Design a protein around this motif. Structure first.
Motif, PDB file in Angstrom:
ATOM      1  N   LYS A 180       1.050  -1.357   0.021  1.00 33.87           N
ATOM      2  CA  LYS A 180      -0.156   0.192  -0.058  1.00 33.87           C
ATOM      3  C   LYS A 180       0.760   1.216  -0.007  1.00 33.87           C
ATOM      4  CE  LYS A 180      -3.488   2.092   3.019  1.00 33.87           C
ATOM      5  NZ  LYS A 180      -4.888   1.821   3.500  1.00 33.87           N
ATOM      6  N   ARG A 181       0.527   2.291  -0.774  1.00 29.15           N
ATOM      7  CA  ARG A 181       1.115   3.521  -0.880  1.00 29.15           C
ATOM      8  C   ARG A 181       0.096   4.740  -0.806  1.00 29.15           C
ATOM      9  NH1 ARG A 181       5.419   3.296  -5.457  1.00 29.15           N
ATOM     10  NH2 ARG A 181       7.199   3.334  -3.799  1.00 29.15           N
ATOM     11  N   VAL A 182       0.430   5.618  -0.181  1.00 32.28           N
ATOM     12  CA  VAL A 182      -0.269   6.880  -0.234  1.00 32.28           C
ATOM     13  C   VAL A 182       0.575   8.183  -0.674  1.00 32.28           C
ATOM     14  CG1 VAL A 182      -1.890   8.290   1.047  1.00 32.28           C
ATOM     15  CG2 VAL A 182      -1.862   5.967   1.832  1.00 32.28           C
ATOM     16  N   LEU A 183      -0.178   8.961  -1.401  1.00 28.70           N
ATOM     17  CA  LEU A 183       0.704  10.181  -1.920  1.00 28.70           C
ATOM     18  C   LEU A 183      -0.177  11.410  -1.716  1.00 28.70           C
ATOM     19  CD1 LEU A 183       2.188   8.031  -4.875  1.00 28.70           C
ATOM     20  CD2 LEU A 183       3.758   9.583  -3.445  1.00 28.70           C
ATOM     21  N   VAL A 233       3.345   9.542   1.789  1.00 31.80           N
ATOM     22  CA  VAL A 233       2.774   9.312   2.979  1.00 31.80           C
ATOM     23  C   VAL A 233       2.856   8.291   3.618  1.00 31.80           C
ATOM     24  CG1 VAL A 233       0.424   9.644   4.163  1.00 31.80           C
ATOM     25  CG2 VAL A 233       1.141  11.343   2.264  1.00 31.80           C
ATOM     26  N   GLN A 234       2.708   6.948   3.257  1.00 28.98           N
ATOM     27  CA  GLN A 234       2.756   5.832   3.872  1.00 28.98           C
ATOM     28  C   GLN A 234       3.176   4.594   2.810  1.00 28.98           C
ATOM     29  OE1 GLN A 234       2.663   6.871   7.272  1.00 28.98           O
ATOM     30  NE2 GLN A 234       2.169   4.613   7.160  1.00 28.98           N
ATOM     31  N   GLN A 235       4.114   3.756   3.233  1.00 26.97           N
ATOM     32  CA  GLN A 235       4.537   2.803   2.387  1.00 26.97           C
ATOM     33  C   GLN A 235       4.671   1.540   3.008  1.00 26.97           C
ATOM     34  OE1 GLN A 235       5.173   3.206  -0.948  1.00 26.97           O
ATOM     35  NE2 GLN A 235       5.280   0.888  -0.823  1.00 26.97           N
ATOM     36  N   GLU A 236       3.658   0.649   2.687  1.00 29.57           N
ATOM     37  CA  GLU A 236       3.701  -0.709   3.319  1.00 29.57           C
ATOM     38  C   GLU A 236       3.940  -1.822   2.438  1.00 29.57           C
ATOM     39  OE1 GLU A 236       2.243  -0.961   6.956  1.00 29.57           O
ATOM     40  OE2 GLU A 236       3.054   1.026   6.436  1.00 29.57           O
TER      41      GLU A 236
END
Ligand code: CA
Ligand code: ZN
Length: 314
Positions: A180-183, A233-236
């Protein structure tokens, strides 16, 4: 005359067959293969007794077996994989610095650099054919893995290739949904746009090589007319592949897993693989060099990841 042979579509479920030796393999089976070699125009020989042949899924049972092993409907897959195998079985797969490589042949430098990367990032394939051959490739028997890569990428032997594009296809057959990635795209007039990506799109980026700079922020021209800022923002994910057009880049030891170097232009390009161990190692097919410092035209850099949280306020 009659000999007994075996037929299969996965090299796992074999089928006992009676073959009229006055006919050809194509006449009784259709398109038939023996370890890649097309023997459709060939009639059975006594040396074939007890040997196993690939065919195309003529009946449903072969189609059922073929989908389970390969996870594709494409009836051309077997001929293309067999056509690739007929070549990759002749390639040399030396152990270079503990990793399975390929001696250069048939413009496979992008395949060698890809294979080398697959061995240094945490990954598992979903089609059994891929995971089985992936295991064997790490053991040194990479011929079937490489032929499968070409079949899944709709590439042919000798054809030029892109490493980033080759990973793209293969990541579609791995189990990366958990990634999962958030930008946040922060544009001074358009605003603070957010995107959430799942799967293959969550681990790949095309624009810059540096992962810390990707965390800090990068400007991108907005669809309005001005500039806009781009940051993670978030890298999973277990890893991240950062790609950029080939440009001179300084590789710093201990800051990355492995990288792709691309020298040359147009039809004269060539891939080398750089990996970070106790020092910097450059694997170029069957060749190996090492150095404490490296600067070259890098186009892909891989990093380790687990879970990342940004320090940037929304
Ligand atoms: Ca090894
Ligand atoms: Zn704007």
């Amino acid at each position: 005359r009659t000999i007994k042979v075996f037929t299969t579509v996965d090299n796992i479920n074999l089928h006992t067959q009676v073959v009229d030796m006055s006919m050809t393999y194509g006449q009784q089976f259709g398109p038939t293969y023996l370890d890649g070699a097309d023997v459709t125009k060939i009639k059975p020989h006594n040396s074939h007794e007890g040997k196993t042949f690939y065919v195309l899924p003529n009946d449903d049972t072969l189609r059922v077996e073929a989908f389970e092993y390969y996870h594709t409907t494409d009836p051309s897959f077997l001929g293309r994989y067999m056509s690739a195998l007929n070549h990759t079985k002749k390639w040399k797969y030396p152990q270079v610095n503990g990793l399975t490589s390929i001696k250069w042949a048939d413009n496979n430098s992008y395949l060698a650099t890809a294979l080398l990367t697959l061995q240094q990032i945490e990954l598992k394939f979903n089609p059994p054919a891929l995971q089985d051959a992936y295991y064997r490739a790490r053991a040194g028997e990479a011929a079937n893995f490489c032929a499968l890569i070409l079949a899944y990428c709709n590439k042919t032997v000798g054809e030029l290739g892109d490493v980033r594009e080759t990973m793209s296809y293969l990541f579609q057959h791995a189990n990366l949904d958990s990634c999962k990635r958030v930008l946040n795209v922060v544009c001074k007039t358009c605003g603070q746009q957010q995107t959430t990506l799942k799967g293959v799109e969550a681990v790949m980026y095309m624009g810059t090589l540096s992962y810390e700079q990707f965390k800090k922020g990068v400007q991108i021209p907005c669809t309005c007319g001005k500039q806009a800022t781009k940051y993670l923002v978030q890298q999973e994910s277990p890893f991240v592949m950062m790609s950029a057009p080939p440009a001179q880049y300084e590789l710093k030891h201990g800051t990355f897993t492995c990288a792709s170097e691309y020298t040359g232009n147009y039809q004269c390009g060539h891939y080398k693989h750089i990996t970070s161990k106790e020092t910097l190692y450059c694997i170029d097919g069957a060749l190996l060099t090492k150095s404490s410092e490296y600067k070259g035209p890098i186009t892909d850099v891989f990093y380790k990841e687990n879970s990342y949280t940004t320090t940037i306020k929304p």
